[PDB]
């Protein structure tokens, strides 16, 4: 009865009663059950599956500028059969591509989507070993990175069966610095990854107690316990934070992984659901800039970039934070362009995302947009995606959230 | 079937089909019917009214740190009677206060609410003439302004009857510069008020064709045609825009009314609904700063504050707009503090709004917050009201939107 709500930054939580007295949405919540897809303990009710699959295959053969009628029907029967006999079914890799592409084309909270059109699909379906996974990942990371010239790709591990033979990597994202909470009340690297770093420690991985130490991809292949693997340094291409003016910057000791790749997130297509399918794209300055660097609950410089900025660090009204940040954002962006790593300032992004929509509507007359997310964390009213009214909605295929593996995991370790 | 959506800034509109294919919110829309209260042609179905009123009166006698049981019951019967006999009813002014206070306390999109506790109620109920209204307004404006030291207040005009004896002022807000769209494809003052300025012209008011000319409060008292009245200059206290450094600023020729007072907006309490009740509060820098000044669809300096800022006005990625704005915001704020007019930089606001909630939950365990609105148009992720999860909802009493009078108005002019 009491809709729980939490203030991220502070980690505070309160239960809302009063909403009951409503005259008769929870749009500002982060992980609504309305956007996930948890575990299972048995396959997928044919009645449910079968009609979905028909839908998909139908969507698929829809694309073509020229129709493959026969193949369409044919494929249709082909599947039903396949399904009726076994229940489950496999998509022709070609399908899986169009899947991932659309599932992205149908991401509600991603300004990126303007080039959903071209992504790299890594058919790791045949995968079968934890260590087999790992390798498959590095192939990705390495392909993705491309020595700074980032290329976005996704590697589809094997789908779901009984839901007890799940394939899952327990990581927020491919590369992400640890976050040891040091003795002296301090806290290193990244507090965000605070609970998880503990995990990797609890499963081996030795605490280099740094503050810019990359975390171990912890994977599980069929439903058995997960295993720790250290990402091969050679693969993690970073960028150092230096200002095109404030020389005192480098002294900050700031750098950041040049590759944003989400690990934990379920892909769902034709009634089929894949519990592991890391995908990457390149950064937008502000996440690095204002989010991990500035956000109070993350790295959190600002105050310092403020003091050494000379600014009125103690007269809030001064707009010093407004000053500081803007410089920090120019640094990050700067560094990147310099050390030759791909990136994109928000403005240019928003300008393009809009172009996407005009295309998307004139195209299929829709575009699942989540304003609360598609708006640059700073400079909102200046980026066009603010004066844009948008309604969002889950479609298909679609990338979903998932429950923290460690929460719902039958530890086969007996 | 086609949810229409418009991009403000550009004035573009598109109909969303695709949402139908939804797996099964419109939170980013501006004026949902879910937040209004249009016309009527007959009173209010006793069955509807009577139970509401009971609710209210009950809420009322609830407040007290010490209960007025007898008076409570008494008042209750008193009303029912009053209602059963006539249907309608009047709230003891004292009630109307607690009304307005709560109706505010229950504003979903206002960071202000942290001091809902003290507002000024102007009982203009007895009003009866257009000209009678006018005077009543100036009393407000004048009280509100207070020679810069702004004080927030509201003046409750007479309630609703048959819904054909509506009391309404056709104004976005008390003071607001005109917006003539000059011959030479130009556009002066404020394009926002473009359709309305035409109106006042169509009803008399002479076009001083300026670009900082205050508009005429156009009012209607009982349901008859509306009449034009020029706000007495002496009452409109403005502020000139000057930078605490960029001397070349004053050359911009920028100033802005120091008093934000919303005209058109219905107050609803105990089943009773008042179609006219202007209320004011003091500015938050960013609306003036980034919204009316910078917003592409408004005044729109930025580019110039950019060029004369020296900045890379042509290399979007430069973050020049990010630079420009921040200065503009310091100016506005600056001027104000200088010319001694009340104002408040967003940061300090957000810091307080949060304090409100912690209070509001610990108080009545709720707080109708609309994240999409309660977030400063610039510097979002830096203000705490971003990492705050919030669900919003219409309660009571409550200030509602209303249909543009000129749309639904039986022009008694025969
Ligand atoms: C054109 C390159 C891309 C850019 C610049 C980009 C940018 C972004 C940004 C800025 C966010 C929100 C950041 C956050 O708050 O975590 C986001 C979210 C997201 N993007 Fe992208 N993206 C790109 C490509 C892609 C691709 C190719 C996919 C799918 C294979 C994708 C899927 C997603 C998803 C699912 C989210 C939501 C993540 C979450 O809920 O945590 N993006 N993207
Ligand atoms: C502490 C002084 C106040 C401050 C600083 C303040 C500030 C604000 C701000 C920044 C907004 C959003 C601006 C926009 O986008 O138009 C807003 C909206 C609003 N405020 Fe306040 N406010 C104050 C007092 C009040 C009071 C006393 C009332 C009720 C008598 C009130 C009622 C509203 C309403 C109804 C809205 C929504 C307006 C709309 O939907 O256009 N505010 N306020
Ligand atoms: C997922 N999030 C909770 C954490 C990583 C930040 O995510 C991203 C930040 C960017 O700037 S670009 C991008 C592209 C594709 C996937 C993710 C991102
Ligand atoms: C209503 N809006 C469409 C137009 C006026 C802007 O509204 C306000 C801007 C501020 O900074 S403060 C404030 C206080 C009380 C009412 C309104 C405001
Ligand atoms: C609590 C609040 O909903 C949350 O902090 C939000 N996070 C994000 C957001 N938008 C983006 N793009 N990324 C976020 O992390 N909007 C709101
Ligand atoms: C289109 C978009 O919903 C609209 O421009 C928004 N306006 C506003 C907003 N928030 C505030 N405070 N004021 C606005 O005018 N959020 C979103």
mmCIF file of N, CA and C in Angstrom, chain A residues 5-9 14-19 21-23 25 28-30 290-291 295 297 316-317 319 321-323 325-327 329-330 345-347 351 361 364-366 371-372 377-382 386-391 393-395, chain B residues 5-9 12 14-19 21-23 25 28-30 290-291 295 297 316-317 319 321-323 325-327 329-330 345-347 351 361 364-366 371-372 377-382 386-391 393-395:
data_model
loop_
_atom_site.group_PDB
_atom_site.id
_atom_site.type_symbol
_atom_site.label_atom_id
_atom_site.label_comp_id
_atom_site.label_asym_id
_atom_site.label_seq_id
_atom_site.Cartn_x
_atom_site.Cartn_y
_atom_site.Cartn_z
ATOM 1 N N UNK A 5 9.829 5.101 -2.300
ATOM 2 C CA UNK A 5 10.538 5.962 -3.242
ATOM 3 C C UNK A 5 11.852 6.309 -2.565
ATOM 4 N N UNK A 6 12.923 6.365 -3.344
ATOM 5 C CA UNK A 6 14.222 6.671 -2.773
ATOM 6 C C UNK A 6 14.898 7.843 -3.458
ATOM 7 N N UNK A 7 15.633 8.615 -2.668
ATOM 8 C CA UNK A 7 16.383 9.723 -3.222
ATOM 9 C C UNK A 7 17.739 9.091 -3.432
ATOM 10 N N UNK A 8 18.114 8.901 -4.689
ATOM 11 C CA UNK A 8 19.389 8.285 -4.985
ATOM 12 C C UNK A 8 20.488 8.959 -4.200
ATOM 13 N N UNK A 9 21.087 9.998 -4.771
ATOM 14 C CA UNK A 9 22.154 10.716 -4.096
ATOM 15 C C UNK A 9 22.345 10.432 -2.613
ATOM 16 N N UNK A 14 11.586 6.790 1.466
ATOM 17 C CA UNK A 14 10.363 7.106 2.191
ATOM 18 C C UNK A 14 9.173 6.442 1.512
ATOM 19 N N UNK A 15 8.181 6.058 2.309
ATOM 20 C CA UNK A 15 6.990 5.407 1.784
ATOM 21 C C UNK A 15 5.859 6.416 1.658
ATOM 22 N N UNK A 16 5.314 6.543 0.457
ATOM 23 C CA UNK A 16 4.238 7.490 0.214
ATOM 24 C C UNK A 16 2.837 6.948 0.499
ATOM 25 N N UNK A 17 2.172 7.525 1.492
ATOM 26 C CA UNK A 17 0.811 7.130 1.843
ATOM 27 C C UNK A 17 -0.123 8.010 1.009
ATOM 28 N N UNK A 18 -0.243 9.250 1.467
ATOM 29 C CA UNK A 18 -1.052 10.305 0.873
ATOM 30 C C UNK A 18 -1.560 10.140 -0.563
ATOM 31 N N UNK A 19 -0.777 9.500 -1.426
ATOM 32 C CA UNK A 19 -1.194 9.326 -2.818
ATOM 33 C C UNK A 19 -2.520 8.586 -2.938
ATOM 34 N N UNK A 21 -5.195 9.297 -1.252
ATOM 35 C CA UNK A 21 -6.214 10.334 -1.273
ATOM 36 C C UNK A 21 -6.279 10.976 -2.665
ATOM 37 N N UNK A 22 -5.716 10.291 -3.658
ATOM 38 C CA UNK A 22 -5.680 10.787 -5.032
ATOM 39 C C UNK A 22 -7.068 10.929 -5.677
ATOM 40 N N UNK A 23 -7.264 11.980 -6.464
ATOM 41 C CA UNK A 23 -8.546 12.233 -7.109
ATOM 42 C C UNK A 23 -8.823 11.195 -8.192
ATOM 43 N N UNK A 25 0.740 8.916 -12.034
ATOM 44 C CA UNK A 25 1.887 8.213 -12.672
ATOM 45 C C UNK A 25 3.124 8.266 -11.784
ATOM 46 N N UNK A 28 9.001 9.454 -12.417
ATOM 47 C CA UNK A 28 10.346 9.788 -11.963
ATOM 48 C C UNK A 28 11.047 8.648 -11.235
ATOM 49 N N UNK A 29 10.419 7.479 -11.181
ATOM 50 C CA UNK A 29 11.046 6.346 -10.518
ATOM 51 C C UNK A 29 12.047 5.733 -11.490
ATOM 52 N N UNK A 30 13.094 5.125 -10.943
ATOM 53 C CA UNK A 30 14.155 4.539 -11.753
ATOM 54 C C UNK A 30 13.898 3.150 -12.313
ATOM 55 N N UNK A 290 29.392 15.653 -15.508
ATOM 56 C CA UNK A 290 28.586 15.945 -14.330
ATOM 57 C C UNK A 290 28.097 14.772 -13.491
ATOM 58 N N UNK A 291 27.884 13.617 -14.115
ATOM 59 C CA UNK A 291 27.373 12.461 -13.378
ATOM 60 C C UNK A 291 28.359 11.687 -12.495
ATOM 61 N N UNK A 295 28.387 14.392 -9.523
ATOM 62 C CA UNK A 295 27.354 13.795 -8.659
ATOM 63 C C UNK A 295 27.858 13.549 -7.231
ATOM 64 N N UNK A 297 26.919 11.534 -5.005
ATOM 65 C CA UNK A 297 26.983 10.108 -4.688
ATOM 66 C C UNK A 297 28.010 9.321 -5.497
ATOM 67 N N UNK A 316 26.659 29.592 -2.033
ATOM 68 C CA UNK A 316 25.781 28.879 -2.956
ATOM 69 C C UNK A 316 25.216 29.770 -4.065
ATOM 70 N N UNK A 317 24.542 30.839 -3.660
ATOM 71 C CA UNK A 317 23.934 31.771 -4.604
ATOM 72 C C UNK A 317 24.882 32.282 -5.684
ATOM 73 N N UNK A 319 26.585 30.769 -7.794
ATOM 74 C CA UNK A 319 26.451 30.023 -9.045
ATOM 75 C C UNK A 319 27.826 29.435 -9.364
ATOM 76 N N UNK A 321 29.012 26.428 -8.522
ATOM 77 C CA UNK A 321 28.852 25.064 -9.015
ATOM 78 C C UNK A 321 28.471 25.167 -10.493
ATOM 79 N N UNK A 322 27.657 26.166 -10.809
ATOM 80 C CA UNK A 322 27.231 26.399 -12.180
ATOM 81 C C UNK A 322 28.468 26.738 -13.006
ATOM 82 N N UNK A 323 29.431 27.388 -12.361
ATOM 83 C CA UNK A 323 30.672 27.786 -13.016
ATOM 84 C C UNK A 323 31.597 26.589 -13.149
ATOM 85 N N UNK A 325 31.359 23.146 -12.784
ATOM 86 C CA UNK A 325 30.885 22.144 -13.725
ATOM 87 C C UNK A 325 31.228 22.505 -15.167
ATOM 88 N N UNK A 326 30.608 23.555 -15.699
ATOM 89 C CA UNK A 326 30.862 23.970 -17.077
ATOM 90 C C UNK A 326 32.318 23.844 -17.502
ATOM 91 N N UNK A 327 33.243 24.113 -16.592
ATOM 92 C CA UNK A 327 34.652 23.987 -16.949
ATOM 93 C C UNK A 327 34.976 22.485 -17.035
ATOM 94 N N UNK A 329 33.193 20.031 -17.652
ATOM 95 C CA UNK A 329 32.626 19.430 -18.844
ATOM 96 C C UNK A 329 33.473 19.751 -20.068
ATOM 97 N N UNK A 330 34.101 20.924 -20.077
ATOM 98 C CA UNK A 330 34.938 21.302 -21.213
ATOM 99 C C UNK A 330 36.237 20.517 -21.176
ATOM 100 N N UNK A 345 29.424 15.981 -27.148
ATOM 101 C CA UNK A 345 28.871 16.988 -26.245
ATOM 102 C C UNK A 345 27.360 16.862 -26.344
ATOM 103 N N UNK A 346 26.654 17.070 -25.236
ATOM 104 C CA UNK A 346 25.207 16.915 -25.263
ATOM 105 C C UNK A 346 24.491 17.688 -26.357
ATOM 106 N N UNK A 347 24.677 18.997 -26.410
ATOM 107 C CA UNK A 347 24.010 19.785 -27.437
ATOM 108 C C UNK A 347 23.901 19.068 -28.779
ATOM 109 N N UNK A 351 20.400 17.835 -30.605
ATOM 110 C CA UNK A 351 20.082 18.317 -31.938
ATOM 111 C C UNK A 351 19.771 17.141 -32.856
ATOM 112 N N UNK A 361 8.689 9.516 -36.638
ATOM 113 C CA UNK A 361 7.263 9.741 -36.788
ATOM 114 C C UNK A 361 6.931 9.621 -38.265
ATOM 115 N N UNK A 364 7.513 5.461 -38.726
ATOM 116 C CA UNK A 364 6.486 4.582 -38.179
ATOM 117 C C UNK A 364 5.527 5.319 -37.234
ATOM 118 N N UNK A 365 5.547 6.648 -37.307
ATOM 119 C CA UNK A 365 4.672 7.468 -36.482
ATOM 120 C C UNK A 365 4.766 7.331 -34.972
ATOM 121 N N UNK A 366 5.933 6.953 -34.461
ATOM 122 C CA UNK A 366 6.089 6.805 -33.023
ATOM 123 C C UNK A 366 7.535 6.919 -32.584
ATOM 124 N N UNK A 371 11.278 11.639 -21.607
ATOM 125 C CA UNK A 371 11.797 12.972 -21.287
ATOM 126 C C UNK A 371 12.710 12.996 -20.055
ATOM 127 N N UNK A 372 12.239 12.493 -18.919
ATOM 128 C CA UNK A 372 13.056 12.503 -17.709
ATOM 129 C C UNK A 372 14.480 11.978 -17.932
ATOM 130 N N UNK A 377 21.658 16.270 -18.247
ATOM 131 C CA UNK A 377 21.689 16.581 -16.809
ATOM 132 C C UNK A 377 22.021 18.017 -16.438
ATOM 133 N N UNK A 378 22.396 18.810 -17.437
ATOM 134 C CA UNK A 378 22.748 20.211 -17.239
ATOM 135 C C UNK A 378 22.460 20.926 -18.550
ATOM 136 N N UNK A 379 21.917 22.138 -18.471
ATOM 137 C CA UNK A 379 21.609 22.913 -19.672
ATOM 138 C C UNK A 379 20.288 22.503 -20.331
ATOM 139 N N UNK A 380 19.453 21.789 -19.585
ATOM 140 C CA UNK A 380 18.178 21.337 -20.114
ATOM 141 C C UNK A 380 17.470 22.266 -21.090
ATOM 142 N N UNK A 381 16.818 23.296 -20.552
ATOM 143 C CA UNK A 381 16.065 24.269 -21.345
ATOM 144 C C UNK A 381 16.764 24.790 -22.590
ATOM 145 N N UNK A 382 18.073 24.559 -22.700
ATOM 146 C CA UNK A 382 18.839 25.023 -23.858
ATOM 147 C C UNK A 382 18.891 23.968 -24.958
ATOM 148 N N UNK A 386 13.569 19.379 -24.594
ATOM 149 C CA UNK A 386 13.060 19.855 -23.311
ATOM 150 C C UNK A 386 11.710 20.452 -23.632
ATOM 151 N N UNK A 387 11.653 21.125 -24.778
ATOM 152 C CA UNK A 387 10.439 21.756 -25.265
ATOM 153 C C UNK A 387 9.796 20.787 -26.226
ATOM 154 N N UNK A 388 10.122 19.515 -26.038
ATOM 155 C CA UNK A 388 9.572 18.449 -26.853
ATOM 156 C C UNK A 388 8.681 17.609 -25.958
ATOM 157 N N UNK A 389 7.399 17.560 -26.295
ATOM 158 C CA UNK A 389 6.460 16.773 -25.517
ATOM 159 C C UNK A 389 6.593 15.338 -25.999
ATOM 160 N N UNK A 390 6.729 14.404 -25.067
ATOM 161 C CA UNK A 390 6.882 13.015 -25.456
ATOM 162 C C UNK A 390 6.237 12.034 -24.504
ATOM 163 N N UNK A 391 5.629 11.009 -25.087
ATOM 164 C CA UNK A 391 4.987 9.950 -24.327
ATOM 165 C C UNK A 391 5.864 8.745 -24.621
ATOM 166 N N UNK A 393 6.708 4.367 -24.056
ATOM 167 C CA UNK A 393 5.998 3.105 -23.900
ATOM 168 C C UNK A 393 6.785 1.880 -24.350
ATOM 169 N N UNK A 394 6.712 0.815 -23.548
ATOM 170 C CA UNK A 394 7.394 -0.447 -23.842
ATOM 171 C C UNK A 394 6.835 -1.136 -25.088
ATOM 172 N N UNK A 395 7.704 -1.458 -26.034
ATOM 173 C CA UNK A 395 7.286 -2.127 -27.258
ATOM 174 C C UNK A 395 8.064 -3.432 -27.407
ATOM 175 N N UNK B 5 0.848 15.512 -29.555
ATOM 176 C CA UNK B 5 1.928 15.983 -28.693
ATOM 177 C C UNK B 5 2.596 17.111 -29.460
ATOM 178 N N UNK B 6 2.999 18.154 -28.747
ATOM 179 C CA UNK B 6 3.629 19.284 -29.405
ATOM 180 C C UNK B 6 4.983 19.623 -28.812
ATOM 181 N N UNK B 7 5.885 20.071 -29.675
ATOM 182 C CA UNK B 7 7.191 20.494 -29.214
ATOM 183 C C UNK B 7 6.984 21.982 -29.056
ATOM 184 N N UNK B 8 6.982 22.450 -27.816
ATOM 185 C CA UNK B 8 6.774 23.859 -27.568
ATOM 186 C C UNK B 8 7.686 24.684 -28.444
ATOM 187 N N UNK B 9 8.883 24.982 -27.953
ATOM 188 C CA UNK B 9 9.836 25.768 -28.719
ATOM 189 C C UNK B 9 9.532 25.968 -30.198
ATOM 190 N N UNK B 12 5.733 22.815 -33.168
ATOM 191 C CA UNK B 12 5.432 21.687 -34.029
ATOM 192 C C UNK B 12 4.580 20.691 -33.249
ATOM 193 N N UNK B 14 2.747 16.545 -33.485
ATOM 194 C CA UNK B 14 2.658 15.253 -34.152
ATOM 195 C C UNK B 14 1.723 14.335 -33.377
ATOM 196 N N UNK B 15 1.028 13.461 -34.098
ATOM 197 C CA UNK B 15 0.096 12.531 -33.477
ATOM 198 C C UNK B 15 0.746 11.165 -33.330
ATOM 199 N N UNK B 16 0.782 10.658 -32.105
ATOM 200 C CA UNK B 16 1.396 9.367 -31.841
ATOM 201 C C UNK B 16 0.461 8.170 -32.021
ATOM 202 N N UNK B 17 0.767 7.325 -32.998
ATOM 203 C CA UNK B 17 -0.020 6.121 -33.252
ATOM 204 C C UNK B 17 0.605 5.011 -32.405
ATOM 205 N N UNK B 18 1.730 4.519 -32.907
ATOM 206 C CA UNK B 18 2.544 3.467 -32.313
ATOM 207 C C UNK B 18 2.324 3.091 -30.845
ATOM 208 N N UNK B 19 1.985 4.062 -30.002
ATOM 209 C CA UNK B 19 1.780 3.773 -28.582
ATOM 210 C C UNK B 19 0.702 2.721 -28.353
ATOM 211 N N UNK B 21 0.522 -0.115 -29.911
ATOM 212 C CA UNK B 21 1.226 -1.387 -29.876
ATOM 213 C C UNK B 21 1.902 -1.574 -28.512
ATOM 214 N N UNK B 22 1.464 -0.796 -27.524
ATOM 215 C CA UNK B 22 2.029 -0.844 -26.177
ATOM 216 C C UNK B 22 1.807 -2.186 -25.460
ATOM 217 N N UNK B 23 2.802 -2.641 -24.708
ATOM 218 C CA UNK B 23 2.716 -3.913 -24.002
ATOM 219 C C UNK B 23 1.707 -3.833 -22.861
ATOM 220 N N UNK B 25 2.473 6.138 -19.485
ATOM 221 C CA UNK B 25 2.163 7.465 -18.884
ATOM 222 C C UNK B 25 2.516 8.596 -19.844
ATOM 223 N N UNK B 28 5.363 13.904 -19.603
ATOM 224 C CA UNK B 28 6.040 15.076 -20.149
ATOM 225 C C UNK B 28 5.106 16.043 -20.866
ATOM 226 N N UNK B 29 3.806 15.775 -20.834
ATOM 227 C CA UNK B 29 2.862 16.672 -21.482
ATOM 228 C C UNK B 29 2.617 17.849 -20.544
ATOM 229 N N UNK B 30 2.301 19.001 -21.124
ATOM 230 C CA UNK B 30 2.090 20.220 -20.353
ATOM 231 C C UNK B 30 0.720 20.398 -19.720
ATOM 232 N N UNK B 290 17.282 31.766 -17.969
ATOM 233 C CA UNK B 290 17.263 30.860 -19.110
ATOM 234 C C UNK B 290 15.953 30.694 -19.868
ATOM 235 N N UNK B 291 14.824 30.848 -19.183
ATOM 236 C CA UNK B 291 13.530 30.660 -19.839
ATOM 237 C C UNK B 291 13.018 31.788 -20.743
ATOM 238 N N UNK B 295 15.443 30.909 -23.826
ATOM 239 C CA UNK B 295 14.528 30.055 -24.602
ATOM 240 C C UNK B 295 14.353 30.546 -26.045
ATOM 241 N N UNK B 297 12.028 30.131 -28.124
ATOM 242 C CA UNK B 297 10.664 30.588 -28.382
ATOM 243 C C UNK B 297 10.251 31.832 -27.601
ATOM 244 N N UNK B 316 29.060 24.563 -31.852
ATOM 245 C CA UNK B 316 28.182 23.968 -30.850
ATOM 246 C C UNK B 316 28.937 23.219 -29.749
ATOM 247 N N UNK B 317 29.745 22.249 -30.160
ATOM 248 C CA UNK B 317 30.518 21.440 -29.224
ATOM 249 C C UNK B 317 31.339 22.247 -28.223
ATOM 250 N N UNK B 319 30.499 24.402 -26.153
ATOM 251 C CA UNK B 319 29.820 24.542 -24.864
ATOM 252 C C UNK B 319 29.668 26.041 -24.601
ATOM 253 N N UNK B 321 27.079 28.004 -25.379
ATOM 254 C CA UNK B 321 25.757 28.264 -24.819
ATOM 255 C C UNK B 321 25.833 27.934 -23.328
ATOM 256 N N UNK B 322 26.575 26.881 -23.009
ATOM 257 C CA UNK B 322 26.756 26.465 -21.627
ATOM 258 C C UNK B 322 27.481 27.587 -20.889
ATOM 259 N N UNK B 323 28.339 28.294 -21.616
ATOM 260 C CA UNK B 323 29.111 29.396 -21.052
ATOM 261 C C UNK B 323 28.238 30.630 -20.921
ATOM 262 N N UNK B 325 24.854 31.376 -21.123
ATOM 263 C CA UNK B 325 23.815 31.252 -20.114
ATOM 264 C C UNK B 325 24.342 31.539 -18.711
ATOM 265 N N UNK B 326 25.201 30.666 -18.189
ATOM 266 C CA UNK B 326 25.749 30.849 -16.847
ATOM 267 C C UNK B 326 26.068 32.297 -16.503
ATOM 268 N N UNK B 327 26.537 33.066 -17.476
ATOM 269 C CA UNK B 327 26.838 34.466 -17.196
ATOM 270 C C UNK B 327 25.498 35.211 -17.064
ATOM 271 N N UNK B 329 22.677 34.237 -16.239
ATOM 272 C CA UNK B 329 22.010 33.918 -14.992
ATOM 273 C C UNK B 329 22.630 34.689 -13.834
ATOM 274 N N UNK B 330 23.932 34.953 -13.912
ATOM 275 C CA UNK B 330 24.597 35.694 -12.844
ATOM 276 C C UNK B 330 24.214 37.162 -12.922
ATOM 277 N N UNK B 345 18.279 32.204 -6.375
ATOM 278 C CA UNK B 345 19.032 31.346 -7.287
ATOM 279 C C UNK B 345 18.488 29.941 -7.095
ATOM 280 N N UNK B 346 18.421 29.158 -8.169
ATOM 281 C CA UNK B 346 17.863 27.820 -8.052
ATOM 282 C C UNK B 346 18.461 26.960 -6.953
ATOM 283 N N UNK B 347 19.770 26.763 -6.966
ATOM 284 C CA UNK B 347 20.394 25.943 -5.938
ATOM 285 C C UNK B 347 19.753 26.103 -4.562
ATOM 286 N N UNK B 351 17.683 23.186 -2.485
ATOM 287 C CA UNK B 351 18.130 22.801 -1.158
ATOM 288 C C UNK B 351 16.970 22.881 -0.174
ATOM 289 N N UNK B 361 6.736 14.632 4.569
ATOM 290 C CA UNK B 361 6.553 13.210 4.792
ATOM 291 C C UNK B 361 6.430 12.990 6.289
ATOM 292 N N UNK B 364 2.642 14.763 6.895
ATOM 293 C CA UNK B 364 1.477 14.010 6.447
ATOM 294 C C UNK B 364 1.854 12.840 5.528
ATOM 295 N N UNK B 365 3.135 12.479 5.542
ATOM 296 C CA UNK B 365 3.623 11.370 4.735
ATOM 297 C C UNK B 365 3.431 11.435 3.229
ATOM 298 N N UNK B 366 3.372 12.638 2.668
ATOM 299 C CA UNK B 366 3.192 12.768 1.231
ATOM 300 C C UNK B 366 3.688 14.100 0.704
ATOM 301 N N UNK B 371 8.635 15.851 -10.664
ATOM 302 C CA UNK B 371 10.039 15.950 -11.071
ATOM 303 C C UNK B 371 10.251 16.764 -12.354
ATOM 304 N N UNK B 372 9.570 16.409 -13.438
ATOM 305 C CA UNK B 372 9.742 17.136 -14.692
ATOM 306 C C UNK B 372 9.658 18.659 -14.529
ATOM 307 N N UNK B 377 15.828 24.307 -14.816
ATOM 308 C CA UNK B 377 16.051 24.185 -16.265
ATOM 309 C C UNK B 377 17.498 24.074 -16.717
ATOM 310 N N UNK B 378 18.421 24.248 -15.776
ATOM 311 C CA UNK B 378 19.850 24.173 -16.054
ATOM 312 C C UNK B 378 20.529 23.749 -14.761
ATOM 313 N N UNK B 379 21.529 22.878 -14.861
ATOM 314 C CA UNK B 379 22.253 22.412 -13.678
ATOM 315 C C UNK B 379 21.522 21.294 -12.927
ATOM 316 N N UNK B 380 20.558 20.669 -13.591
ATOM 317 C CA UNK B 380 19.793 19.601 -12.970
ATOM 318 C C UNK B 380 20.537 18.699 -11.996
ATOM 319 N N UNK B 381 21.305 17.756 -12.540
ATOM 320 C CA UNK B 381 22.067 16.790 -11.747
ATOM 321 C C UNK B 381 22.837 17.362 -10.568
ATOM 322 N N UNK B 382 22.996 18.686 -10.524
ATOM 323 C CA UNK B 382 23.724 19.335 -9.434
ATOM 324 C C UNK B 382 22.794 19.736 -8.295
ATOM 325 N N UNK B 386 16.866 15.947 -8.151
ATOM 326 C CA UNK B 386 17.102 15.268 -9.422
ATOM 327 C C UNK B 386 17.307 13.818 -9.049
ATOM 328 N N UNK B 387 18.001 13.620 -7.932
ATOM 329 C CA UNK B 387 18.287 12.297 -7.403
ATOM 330 C C UNK B 387 17.232 12.002 -6.365
ATOM 331 N N UNK B 388 16.098 12.672 -6.517
ATOM 332 C CA UNK B 388 14.968 12.488 -5.626
ATOM 333 C C UNK B 388 13.859 11.837 -6.432
ATOM 334 N N UNK B 389 13.466 10.639 -6.019
ATOM 335 C CA UNK B 389 12.400 9.934 -6.706
ATOM 336 C C UNK B 389 11.094 10.495 -6.172
ATOM 337 N N UNK B 390 10.184 10.853 -7.069
ATOM 338 C CA UNK B 390 8.922 11.415 -6.630
ATOM 339 C C UNK B 390 7.744 11.040 -7.500
ATOM 340 N N UNK B 391 6.624 10.777 -6.839
ATOM 341 C CA UNK B 391 5.384 10.435 -7.514
ATOM 342 C C UNK B 391 4.498 11.633 -7.220
ATOM 343 N N UNK B 393 0.517 13.674 -7.643
ATOM 344 C CA UNK B 393 -0.903 13.352 -7.703
ATOM 345 C C UNK B 393 -1.824 14.476 -7.247
ATOM 346 N N UNK B 394 -2.911 14.678 -7.996
ATOM 347 C CA UNK B 394 -3.907 15.706 -7.689
ATOM 348 C C UNK B 394 -4.653 15.422 -6.384
ATOM 349 N N UNK B 395 -4.659 16.387 -5.477
ATOM 350 C CA UNK B 395 -5.347 16.233 -4.203
ATOM 351 C C UNK B 395 -6.365 17.358 -4.043
#
